[PDB]
């Protein structure tokens, strides 16, 4: 089911990040857009835009150690179909993210998956959410 694809995708995405950041970029389309935690820079963090699989790999690889330390509590998943022939999948996740020894950050993250049996990430945006109070 589509719910199964989404859950599997999310689990695999974050887990591959723990195991090898230098291979993460291959789950992205060649022309993918990434907006991710700016490791090169409060209950929010700045993000940075990165375009294309080569630059996405340079990003994850330069930040390997930090990327490997990423952990989360995944609270919610929403999905819809989108794109050409309604065959792509739009996914929104929310939860609380942290890295080894850091406080938690509330986040929302959106992906779009384009069919390659498999899918390539064409879009990946994270946004941190500050407390109401």
């Amino acid at each position: 089911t589509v719910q199964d694809i989404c859950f599997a995708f999310l689990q695999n995405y974050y887990e591959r990040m723990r195991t090898d950041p230098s291979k993460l970029a291959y789950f992205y389309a060649s022309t993918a857009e990434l907006t991710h935690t700016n490791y090169q820079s409060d209950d929010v963090l700045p993000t940075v835009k990165v375009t294309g699989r080569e630059n996405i790999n340079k990003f994850f690889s330069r930040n390997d150690a930090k990327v490997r330390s990423l952990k989360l509590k995944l609270d919610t998943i929403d999905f819809q179909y989108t794109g050409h022939l309604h065959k792509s999948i739009l996914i929104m996740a929310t939860g609380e993210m942290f890295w080894t020894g850091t406080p938690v950050y509330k986040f929302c993250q959106t992906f779009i998956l384009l069919p390659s049996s498999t899918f390539d990430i064409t879009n990946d945006i994270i946004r941190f959410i500050s407390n109401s109070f």
């Binding site: 689990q11 887990e15 209950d43 989360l72 509590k73 995944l74 609380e96 406080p103 938690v104």
Partner: peptide, 25 residues
Amino acid sequence: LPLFINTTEAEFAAASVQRYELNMK
């Protein structure tokens, strides 16, 4: 679900307490 990914829950609870202590500082 919630689902803990790359972490345990106790580890999450500790990170959450960290945020709470920062909020009240």
